[PDB]
RNA sequence: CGAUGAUUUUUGCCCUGCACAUUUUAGAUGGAUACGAAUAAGACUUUUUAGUCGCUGGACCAUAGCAGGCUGGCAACGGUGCGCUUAGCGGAAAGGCUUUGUGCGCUUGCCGGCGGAUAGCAAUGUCAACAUGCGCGGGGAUAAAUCCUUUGCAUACGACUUAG
RNA sequence: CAUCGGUUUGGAGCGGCAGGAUAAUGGCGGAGGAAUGUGGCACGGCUUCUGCUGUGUGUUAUAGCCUCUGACGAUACUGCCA
């Protein structure tokens, strides 16, 4: 066959889930320009934003009509359960682990070191025989 | 103006398998294989089916859009080169001095040797590019046939032969001698 | 600038001959009310035998966007001065606020015609309700059905000077 | 136990200066790992030590110290202004200083 | 943002002047910098344009004695060095010390062939230039103006990359074995607690 | 103002500075480019300028008015006894140029070449190369190790050879030792050729054939300090010029307010290093031939 | 900038294992932590259709013990430091990267017993790599250059080519 | 080191109050309308109709949107806090 390698880009389209401020989720509801979109979400304010200020996530909210108001976006977001889909990805998991690490205390860091010593002992023991 | 999207559709004949990976096109047909690097252009490819390939430019300005149909045409020339071939015919034009053209082989290399051009004692030699076949036509007097799979190589050999036979220090409107491309077609007639 | 749309209303000072002069309203795009009232008198003396000294400002009010989160297409009619003459032009902008389209216009004529704020008159700003009202192809290309486009070659901003891994531009 | 450091690494970058005139009474210090005025405000008021070696021993030691303190931030990239008891000599431009964790307010 | 003992920069794909300014501020502030693969550096603009600029540079020489004039160095590392030195107060003792803090090379000679090379994103050509613009490779500009050792460097760079590939294949193999050992000790008491701490 | 009339410059700016050569032995700046397909052979030879003579020769140049007719031509005799091979050097390609890796020497060096390494030979203990001569002790594996290093890493191989100056009428006893690059064959072939020729004589007939065109490297005749008139061939000033006439009248314009490097000045003339090319070999004579 | 020859019979020189004391530092204070290449691309699995990873190093390794002391036990047969030792690779400036066996330690993988005070509420509160000298110990080698006379392939004088 | 007084630079500072179209929005309710027309329906090209899809129709259906509006409730912005 032809065997053409295609790009795996993320598209600016109605229904794209985006991160805003590296904390909160929102979805694209309508495209303004090459540079600007209108975003909305359950926990964010409906606003016109520049695509440079947001990051497209690999998640699409399916069947979201163009220009949907806040109620429609919230209802379809709850139905598609976008929050759970986001929280199950390695991206959100790495963000959560970064936050959890940033909340450790000095005593907890000491415990982390001690447990790491124990796990390294076990790992070297397993590695030498395999 | 930054056109949002511009598209072109390749058409792949039945026996041809285009193959694109990282802007390196490899076209395979009954007549052989041809390859082309397009890394100097920002284009993306989508396989619609086995008979069509979409060529896209996203958010391209006037010149970058202009570089899109040329990509299409280059790949199309590759496609028709491995399924029909290319054939350029050259006619020998002289008023008095016959042009003596031979296909010689020196140092293991093929050359086109032009002698007696305008009576000159100089011997002109043109290297024959790889994948290009030269032939002295039997059906026509004073005709050279340049054929091959690659249109670029064939046309460039024809241009080399035409350019090496330029007339100097004369009225070229009067001294019309030279070797000129008379027919640009394909090996397989259609 | 960073602008607001103002409703400025003024009149000639009442005389014993004319004790209720006509009230004139203008829509002014100005950064603040000091420039809003300044621009008002600038245009009235282009249209009427009035001055700030012989006139009176009656009201200055901000005109807020009706639907600030609805994407619109605006047509703006302009009268600007170039280095050689005076020209009328019409251009179109996509935005959610009427003010933000005028702000884009000022950036755009600065960029494409070297036209400063002082060289521009806004004749009219109209929201184009029908898709057939859109004349310019640079905003008509965003009114097509099921519009999608990627953003190839993403450049990520780093907090550090040195990076230990190879750069990438996927997105 | 391989590490014993209780100070943050710093560098003496510059004096306070315009294009042509320098003010030795104020030093510009780069605290390691600080890249914004918000980060640098943790270190306001902390004591700074410039530790150096000298030819003559004083009480059996060839190590001398000039003490200072962080007074304010500088610019937008997390440099701070420091005030030392004796001005840091200009030869120390690029030399490392010690940003102490006291007076502590944690 | 850490203070490093030596920062070794892989110069491939870096814009000449942006890397030069960053390295100048680094060495002025007491940081030792090594730049390797200066033949893979980049200048914005087509090759012919930068070659014309270098020929403008070559025009300049002391009239009464050519030996006194500017010394036009042709090696890519020396082109980068000239760019950096123009950004340093090199006629003071402090600028001289800062320049002593710097080293520039063609290729990756020892001992840096077995050390870590970093990149500088603020000066990377693929991240800075608009994707359609034309650029020059300093290795090609150097050969066009007199540099003699282009083919020597590429022969030695291919030998280094063959050796560096053997390194990576070995390192990748031991990473695969260690990952399989860390998988065995997962869901253990130490591993479960470390997962609750974010590790 | 411009010159009233045009004239070419006096002398060449491509032979500056007109200073004394750093050494009396002319050094080969560039050797012939190596071709692997050729046999292993030397590219240079050292000789001594004996004198000039005259020959008579029939010219073979069709279209010339002297064709098939006798011409009388000046010729130079170069006394060239065979050179002795005593060493070999390996060179490595580096991004900074060729670099000598190792030098391997022969076991025995004659006294005339060991005098090369002395300023006061008669006052010396003559200790040169004695420990190195001991390096050949009963297995000579140090020498083989260095030769293997040359084979493994060198790209350019040059032999070390010295003249047998005792066979010439010169009263000088120091031999002249020079590096002569080996061309042809692989690096291993060159190293084997050099090793097998240690302490052997190599003749001119193994380096140069008759009718060859060869180049001559030498330091020219010294003339000492010379004025501009003969150093640079400038025009003598009129007879009635005050303070003398063997000068350059104007050594510069007012600006640049310096003397330029292109102006002819008095200085040392002759004793320069020159490379002279395309000298035809009319005869490679043999010392054993009585005719 | 490299290769190479010879390096004082003087108590002078070289190499090396220590031990002590000194001078210096453009500036140690856990670790410079090694593919290459593309960027309109990379890498996994099936299938070449599709899904997944990145979205920064806030990472990775190391990190507990009088600046880290003295002792005991358990579990493992691992980890690590040093000393010999085996083999291989590295010439771009290799002067480094691996590796075999062995011995002596330590081990915080787990559980114990004893010690630190008073430097007084902080005062760098002194802990490093490079160099040199000096005492020992073990090996090792045993020159030239200049002036002077001479030469004339050189030359104003220096310098140069020679010879002694 | 503490506390004070003078001057001064800050905080991802926190709270209360006022004004405006007594913000404009949004959410909820009602009425009307259209298309870059959702479902459906009727023809098609590739699909064992596997976000299948295209073109017509028409007006919420198996998506929605726009305009006007009714009663509430916030926030932004700008001020004030002895």
UniProtKB/Swiss-Prot annotation, chain A:
Biological processes, Gene Ontology terms: ribosomal large subunit biogenesis; translation
Keyword Lipid biosynthesis applies: no
Coiled-coil regions, chain positions: none
Top-rank lineage group of the source organism: Eukaryota
Keyword Aminoacyl-tRNA synthetase: no
Keyword line: Cytoplasm, Ribonucleoprotein, Ribosomal protein
Molecular function in Gene Ontology: RNA binding; structural constituent of ribosome
GO cellular component terms, semicolon-separated: cell surface; cytosolic large ribosomal subunit; hyphal cell wall; preribosome
InterPro entries named among the record's database cross-references: Rib_uL2_dom2 (IPR014722), Ribosomal_eL14 (IPR039660), Ribosomal_eL14_dom (IPR002784), Translation_prot_SH3-like_sf (IPR008991)
Main localisation: cytoplasm
Pfam families (UniProt xref): Ribosomal_L14e (PF01929)
Disulphide bonds in the chain: none
Protein localization: Cytoplasm
Function comment: Component of the ribosome, a large ribonucleoprotein complex responsible for the synthesis of proteins in the cell. The small ribosomal subunit (SSU) binds messenger RNAs (mRNAs) and translates the encoded message by selecting cognate aminoacyl-transfer RNA (tRNA) molecules. The large subunit (LSU) contains the ribosomal catalytic site termed the peptidyl transferase center (PTC), which catalyzes the formation of peptide bonds, thereby polymerizing the amino acids delivered by tRNAs into a polypeptide chain.
Subunit structure: Component of the large ribosomal subunit. Mature ribosomes consist of a small (40S) and a large (60S) subunit. The 40S subunit contains about 32 different proteins and 1 molecule of RNA (18S). The 60S subunit contains 45 different proteins and 3 molecules of RNA (25S, 5.8S and 5S).
Protein name: Large ribosomal subunit protein eL14
From Swiss-Prot, chain C:
Subcellular location: Cytoplasm
Stored InterPro entries: Ribosomal_eL20, Ribosomal_eL20_dom, Ribosomal_eL20_eukaryotes
Keyword Lyase belongs to the record: no
Any Gene Ontology CC annotation: cell surface
Keyword flag Zinc: no
Keywords carried by this UniProt record: Cytoplasm, Ribonucleoprotein, Ribosomal protein
Any one GO molecular-function label of the UniProt entry: structural constituent of ribosome
Annotated GO biological process: cytoplasmic translation
Oligomeric form and interacting partners: Component of the large ribosomal subunit. Mature ribosomes consist of a small (40S) and a large (60S) subunit. The 40S subunit contains about 32 different proteins and 1 molecule of RNA (18S). The 60S subunit contains 45 different proteins and 3 molecules of RNA (25S, 5.8S and 5S).
Known role: Component of the ribosome, a large ribonucleoprotein complex responsible for the synthesis of proteins in the cell. The small ribosomal subunit (SSU) binds messenger RNAs (mRNAs) and translates the encoded message by selecting cognate aminoacyl-transfer RNA (tRNA) molecules. The large subunit (LSU) contains the ribosomal catalytic site termed the peptidyl transferase center (PTC), which catalyzes the formation of peptide bonds, thereby polymerizing the amino acids delivered by tRNAs into a polypeptide chain.
HAMAP family in alphabetical order: Ribosomal_eL20 (MF_00273)
Similarity field: Belongs to the eukaryotic ribosomal protein eL20 family.
Protein name (database record): Large ribosomal subunit protein eL20
Taxonomic source organism: Candida albicans (strain SC5314 / ATCC MYA-2876) (Yeast)
From Swiss-Prot, chain D:
Family stated for the protein in its record: Belongs to the eukaryotic ribosomal protein eL33 family.
Localization, UniProt: Cytoplasm
CC terms in the record's Gene Ontology section: cytosolic large ribosomal subunit
Principal subcellular localisation of the protein: cytoplasm
A matching Pfam family: Ribosomal_L35Ae
Classification via Gene3D superfamilies: translation elongation factor selb, chain A, domain 4
Species of the source: Candida albicans (strain SC5314 / ATCC MYA-2876) (Yeast)
Domain of life: Eukaryota
GO molecular function: structural constituent of ribosome
Protein name as annotated: Large ribosomal subunit protein eL33
Lineage summary: Eukaryota, Fungi, Dikarya, Ascomycota, Saccharomycotina
Function of the protein: Component of the ribosome, a large ribonucleoprotein complex responsible for the synthesis of proteins in the cell. The small ribosomal subunit (SSU) binds messenger RNAs (mRNAs) and translates the encoded message by selecting cognate aminoacyl-transfer RNA (tRNA) molecules. The large subunit (LSU) contains the ribosomal catalytic site termed the peptidyl transferase center (PTC), which catalyzes the formation of peptide bonds, thereby polymerizing the amino acids delivered by tRNAs into a polypeptide chain.
Name of the gene encoding the protein in the UniProt record: RPL33A
Known partners and oligomeric status: Component of the large ribosomal subunit. Mature ribosomes consist of a small (40S) and a large (60S) subunit. The 40S subunit contains about 32 different proteins and 1 molecule of RNA (18S). The 60S subunit contains 45 different proteins and 3 molecules of RNA (25S, 5.8S and 5S).
GO BP terms: cytoplasmic translation; ribosomal large subunit biogenesis
Swiss-Prot record, chain F:
GO biological process, one term: ribosomal large subunit assembly
GO-annotated cellular components: cell surface; cytosolic large ribosomal subunit; small-subunit processome
Keyword Cell cycle: no
Subcellular location: Cytoplasm
Quaternary assembly: Component of the large ribosomal subunit. Mature ribosomes consist of a small (40S) and a large (60S) subunit. The 40S subunit contains about 32 different proteins and 1 molecule of RNA (18S). The 60S subunit contains 45 different proteins and 3 molecules of RNA (25S, 5.8S and 5S).
Family label: Belongs to the universal ribosomal protein uL3 family.
Disulfide bonds: none
Record-given protein name: Large ribosomal subunit protein uL3
GO molecular function, one term: structural constituent of ribosome
Keywords: Cytoplasm, Ribonucleoprotein, Ribosomal protein
Primary residence: cytoplasm
Role played: Component of the ribosome, a large ribonucleoprotein complex responsible for the synthesis of proteins in the cell. The small ribosomal subunit (SSU) binds messenger RNAs (mRNAs) and translates the encoded message by selecting cognate aminoacyl-transfer RNA (tRNA) molecules. The large subunit (LSU) contains the ribosomal catalytic site termed the peptidyl transferase center (PTC), which catalyzes the formation of peptide bonds, thereby polymerizing the amino acids delivered by tRNAs into a polypeptide chain.
